[PDB]
Write a protein that binds this ligand. Structure first.
Ligand SMILES: Cc1cc2nc3c(=O)[nH]c(=O)nc-3n(C[C@H](O)[C@H](O)[C@H](O)COP(=O)(O)O)c2cc1C
Ligand SMILES: Cc1cc2nc3c(=O)[nH]c(=O)nc-3n(C[C@H](O)[C@H](O)[C@H](O)COP(=O)(O)O)c2cc1C
Ligand SMILES: O=C(O)/C=C/c1ccccc1O
Ligand SMILES: O=C(O)/C=C/c1ccccc1O
Lengths: 217, 217
């Protein structure tokens, strides 16, 4: 099988973890760097990735399921790490300035092309909320990073569970300082599936027929 | 360098294509199948991928830049193919029926459980607009597929240009029947970069410091 297809056919949504297997620090660093290298509109990188690693953090994450979506709760303590994909509520020129400043330092642009580069910012101004939030534009960038992460995990042979069945308001209450100026609509548990009880590990994958999703003109 | 990091460090946004080089049909098939295998909430696959391949299609795509974002226009005819990432305006039971029916054909689920698998649908109405639309929930799924596509292209060593600088209104008029019931906010040109005029091919990549985007708890 072609290496790419094999990876994408063999990755799946784990439904039960093995609590005695953890992701190595070597593999965790590759995944975090892969997330950092993700592409985004105007290189805005309107995101933050919060890694829930310690037992104390796992407890706090475990507690965010007190009100809803408890079918996802068992995974928190059983899995290796949980990653929260946070997107910024509003993106300002000061936020973009952090990007352009780093670009000047990295030698992509000099101050000359810089002030001119600040113009790329109009593409942000164009996208917003009636109230003033760019979150309708930043959330999709975070999902792109997530798509990148899932492909990365398939290459590292690490199991995972994407979770939209989380409590955003409670997460912002529990991770108050960390999610300041951000929101979190999706999380990702990673680890190693349970050898016997993960029932999804042996169910065939199912997608719509090629002709139903792809059109060639 | 670690294979995964090498791929993500070496992929970039092409700013000029070589008109004489096309993507082979063998590579195109791997990419399309990779897009089809993308994960989505409840396996909804609320998307459609439109491949602009023919000269006639390229002309139509070229014409959608008549009003805005003409900086992206030159790539249309110069690159190999353009892929439109379309997300469904509203998601219904009839839509889910298609997924569930294919699941039974794939043998993932037995005919008897189709009806009980519809239970996962409550998560969709939980994202129903006042207008009865779900596009705020479907658009992010499309971006996940896009993140998957970018990683896939880095593995195949094919150049690309993600484009949000497109005209969704004009695209809907030009690809009237193809985008019916969908919207398109992002497109992706693929091909081979121009050996001498693609200025971005030799500029270093720049991302925020690890500590600015990743927090470990
Ligand atoms: C954005 C998103 C959110 C999802 N949320 C959940 C979740 O809350 N819990 C879980 O069990 N599965 C979740 N999944 C898993 C999907 O059911 C799964 O990706 C889809 O069925 C395709 O199967 P595979 O992932 O096994 O290919 C979600 C997937 C996506 C991409
Ligand atoms: C969602 C999205 C839309 C983008 N739109 C454009 C676009 O319209 N035109 C273009 O030249 N670049 C576009 N880009 C490219 C970004 O500028 C680029 O991905 C970012 O600067 C990071 O650089 P790399 O892609 O070279 O790593 C877009 C990127 C993303 C992910
Ligand atoms: O990333 C860039 O160079 C342009 C991005 C962009 C342009 C126009 C409209 C929307 C965009 O994300
Ligand atoms: O994909 C699944 O099995 C559940 C997805 C989900 C659940 C609750 C809320 C939002 C969701 O996408």
């Amino acid at each position: 099988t072609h290496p790419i297809i094999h990876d994408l056919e063999n990755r799946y949504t784990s439904k039960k973890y093995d609590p005695s297997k953890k992701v190595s620090q070597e593999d965790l660093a590759v995944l975090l760097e892969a997330l950092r290298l993700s592409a985004s509109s105007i290189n805005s990188q309107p995101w933050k990735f919060i890694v829930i690693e310690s037992d104390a953090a796992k407890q706090r994450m475990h507690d965010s399921f007190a009100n809803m979506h408890q079918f996802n709760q068992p995974h928190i303590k059983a899995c290796s790490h949980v990653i929260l994909f946070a997107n910024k509520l509003s993106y300002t020129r000061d936020d973009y300035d952090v990007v352009l400043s780093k670009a000047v330092a990295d030698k992509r642009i000099t101050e000359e092309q810089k002030e001119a580069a600040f113009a790329s910012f109009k593409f942000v101004e164009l996208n917003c909320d009636e109230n003033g939030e760019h979150k309708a534009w930043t959330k999709p960038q975070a999902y792109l990073a997530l798509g990148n992460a899932l492909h990365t995990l398939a290459r590292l042979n690490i199991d995972s569970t994407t979770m939209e069945g989380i409590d955003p308001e409670l997460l912002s209450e529990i991770f108050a300082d960390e999610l300041k100026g951000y929101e979190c609509h999706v999380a990702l548990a990673i680890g190693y599936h349970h050898p016997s009880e993960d029932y999804n590990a042996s169910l065939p994958k199912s997608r719509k027929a090629f002709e139903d999703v792809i059109t060639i003109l």
